[PDB]
């Protein structure tokens, strides 16, 4: 297979390069405009404030940037991200390998503990997921059988019914773990339908950018909400595990 | 299994709750540090520049925050969506690492990202299994020759196998964990602790994004910048085995 792997490797590289071109094309113009806007803000501030040098305003912006980067809020001047609810949720983002990162560890102790927490945590959760997966399969297939049998009752072929059940399985999951949550989050997080789908998928793929995080919003008095989502994650991931393995098979069939 | 899964579930929940307690204990004390630093910077600036009202400095910080939010960079290149950085970003997707140190701003960008990942992750998954086996068999070929030396000192061969496999996951570790931590220490101006934290957060595919090499060709060693994706690919393979061996151990007990 060594020839095939070189072919596969180059295929992935081409895929990344094509991804890179598309992402640049779509994202770079806005990033260049943001840069121009920072520059416009500096030039207006110098014109307004003659006792400030270009270079002193430069340090202010760098120092401000570092503080915002540490999670400082521009809106306030006062003085919990690590309340038991959010801290539980943060631990959840580790073992799931989602790793939103919308709140960072500041302590060397925090980081050192995180290493061993993850090294023990991820494989542990991996085992549970396989378990929940097997359980999920049994549950749905036994359930799908009854409606599967109604198709069999109207005399349709058994080999046809397996694939109908397979397709039906995919539909059931999507409604329960893709569309419902997107609709849920749309209402709860005041996101757009597309923002919500983006979040849902980025979450269940375990990519976890952290640009979008359900519950994170400081204002919301719904701490019970955030872990409840973590149960959706638990159930969602097994569903998406199946989807991700199966789409690989589709690519295997194409190759 | 019924007992097993509910037992395992409760175990995981307890683990999460105990994790929560430990994190809150360590991290809640320092929550407001970045707010304190911003405030320090503001007040120090008002003292230095009497032509500036607290309210005018206020808008500057909001306007700067929005610019940075849009991907503007404090400048004193630097493009996160130049072909090099955009390649690396696409890499963060299919690997499921997802640093997010650079966010998508366009709804079109997000829409494409969905399909790019949904097709891209399994494709990489396939290649990873492939690259895992190819290296695995090649390493195993190497393992046999090491096993021979142990065999010729009359170590029982089952002991030799485990000894070799342990050496297996140790040479891999030195090759992919220690070298980078040293590399990053020098290259990124990180502490050896920050570097191992980065390496492991990376190879576990957690990808917080608090620490990122960046694969950004800057100068001095520009070749190495995208080259670390090579370490990631190779490293991920080694760490896959590490994760499974830790996982299998938990199953064993």
């Amino acid at each position, epitope marked *: 297979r060594s020839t095939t792997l070189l072919a596969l490797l180059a295929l992935v590289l081409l895929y990344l390069v094509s991804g890179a071109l598309v992402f640049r094309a779509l994202e770079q113009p806005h990033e260049q405009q943001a840069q121009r806007e920072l520059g416009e803000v500096r*030039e207006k501030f*110098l014109r307004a404030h*003659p*006792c400030v*040098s270009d270079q002193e305003l430069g340090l202010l912006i760098k120092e401000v940037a570092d503080a915002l980067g540490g999670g400082a809020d521009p809106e306030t001047q006062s003085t919990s991200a690590w309340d038991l609810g959010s801290a539980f949720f943060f631990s959840g983002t580790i073992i799931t390998t989602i790793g939103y990162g919308n709140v960072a560890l500041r302590t060397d102790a925090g980081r050192l503990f995180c290493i061993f927490y993850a090294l023990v945590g991820i494989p542990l959760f991996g085992i549970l997921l396989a378990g929940v997966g097997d359980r999920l399969g049994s549950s749905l297939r036994h359930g799908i059988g009854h409606i599967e049998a109604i198709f069999l009752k109207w005399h349709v072929p058994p080999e046809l019914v397996r694939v109908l059940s397979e397709m039906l399985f995919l539909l059931i999951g999507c409604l329960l773990f893709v569309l419902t949550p997107t609709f849920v989050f749309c209402y709860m997080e005041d996101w757009s339908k597309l923002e919500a789908i983006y979040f849902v998928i980025v979450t269940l793929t375990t990519v976890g950018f952290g640009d979008y995080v359900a519950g994170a919003d400081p204002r919301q008095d719904s701490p019970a909400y955030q872990p409840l989502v973590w149960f959706w994650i638990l159930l969602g991931l097994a569903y998406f595990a199946s989807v991700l393995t199966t789409i690989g098979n589709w690519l295997r069939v194409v190759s | 299994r019924s007992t097993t899964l509910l037992a395992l579930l409760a175990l995981v929940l307890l683990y999460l709750v105990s994790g929560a307690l430990v994190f809150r204990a360590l991290e809640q004390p320092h929550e407001q540090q970045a707010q304190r630093e911003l405030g320090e910077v503001r007040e120090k600036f008002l003292r*230095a520049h009497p032509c500036v009202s607290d309210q005018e400095l206020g808008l500057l910080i909001k306007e700067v925050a929005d610019a940075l939010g849009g991907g503007a960079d404090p400048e004193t290149s630097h493009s996160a969506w130049d072909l090099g950085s955009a390649f690396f970003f696409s890499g963060t997707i299919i690997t499921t690492i997802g640093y997010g140190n650079v966010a998508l701003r366009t709804d079109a960008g997000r829409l494409f990202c969905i399909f790019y990942a949904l097709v891209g992750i399994p494709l990489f998954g396939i290649l990873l299994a492939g690259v895992g086996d190819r290296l695995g068999s090649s390493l195993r070929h190497g393992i046999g020759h090491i096993e021979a030396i142990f065999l010729k000192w009359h170590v029982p061969p089952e002991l030799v196998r485990v000894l070799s496999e342990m050496l297996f996951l140790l040479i891999g570790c030195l090759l992919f964990v220690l070298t980078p931590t040293f590399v990053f220490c020098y290259m990124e101006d990180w502490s050896k602790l920050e570097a191992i934290y980065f390496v492991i957060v990376t190879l576990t595919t957690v990808g917080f994004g608090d620490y990122v090499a960046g694969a950004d060709p800057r100068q001095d060693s520009p070749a190495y910048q995208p080259l670390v994706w090579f370490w990631i690919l190779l490293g991920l393979a080694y760490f896959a085995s590490v994760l499974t061996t830790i996982g299998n151990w938990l199953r064993v007990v």
Partner: antibody, heavy 116, light 107 residues
């Protein structure tokens, strides 16, 4: 009337250093950034560096990093430029000028001659 | 390290001629400023922020431009306009100047 009054022409030996001054009047010295500019007949007008007279903050053109030291006396509202280990390449007219984006007021200039 | 190019370096105008001198920037710049210098005297702020006239500057002077191309214009050349005109930029530190454009009277 905003005014920048520079000290007179200076003649110094190769290798010597030199210090020139600019007293401001008609405005608050500490309110505005102060700059020095070099005019040689052959070359472009060249920005040397700036000082914030209120904070003492300084930055230099990379081309003059080692050469030039800017300082101020807040009490006498006077800006100073020092030039070190002088060569004939430093023979020029030097101006102090005010501004943080545009140089809105200039001194009359001082002529430096480096010569044995 | 932004470079400003004034060409030609010297130019001549009969009284009543419309004159335009241009300043090319090696990369994009948000605002261009201009100084007038007559032999024996320091540069004077002439135009700032591309098209703003400094206090004493007579109305026959205009400035214009954007991006990497900027211009100073005299609607009708006068005797007292014979001088050297410099562009300068400060959209990027360090601020930089054109080599200047010397405008002589034609006779």
């Amino acid at each position: 009337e905003v005014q920048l009054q520079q000290s007179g022409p200076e003649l110094v030996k190769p290798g010597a250093s030199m210090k020139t001054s600019c007293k401001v009047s008609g405005y608050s010295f500490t309110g505005y950034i102060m700059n020095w500019v070099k005019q040689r007949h052959g070359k472009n007008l060249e920005w040397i560096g700036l000082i914030n007279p209120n904070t003492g903050y300084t930055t230099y053109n990379q081309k003059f990093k080692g050469k030039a030291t800017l300082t101020v006396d807040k009490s006498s509202s006077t800006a100073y430029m020092e030039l070190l280990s002088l060569t004939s390449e430093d023979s020029a007219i030097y101006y102090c000028t005010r501004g943080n984006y545009v140089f809105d007021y200039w001194g009359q200039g001082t002529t430096l001659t480096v010569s044995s | 390290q932004i470079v400003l190019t004034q060409s030609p370096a010297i130019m001549s105008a009969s009284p009543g001629e419309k004159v335009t001198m241009t300043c090319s920037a090696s990369s994009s710049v948000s605002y261009m400023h201009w100084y007038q210098q007559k032999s024996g005297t320091s540069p004077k702020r002439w135009i700032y922020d591309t098209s703003k006239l400094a206090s004493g500057v007579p109305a026959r002077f205009s400035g214009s431009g954007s991006g990497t191309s900027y211009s100073l214009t005299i609607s009708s050349m006068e005797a007292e306009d014979a001088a050297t005109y410099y562009c300068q930029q400060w959209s990027n530190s360090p601020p930089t100047f054109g080599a200047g454009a010397k405008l002589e009277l034609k006779r």
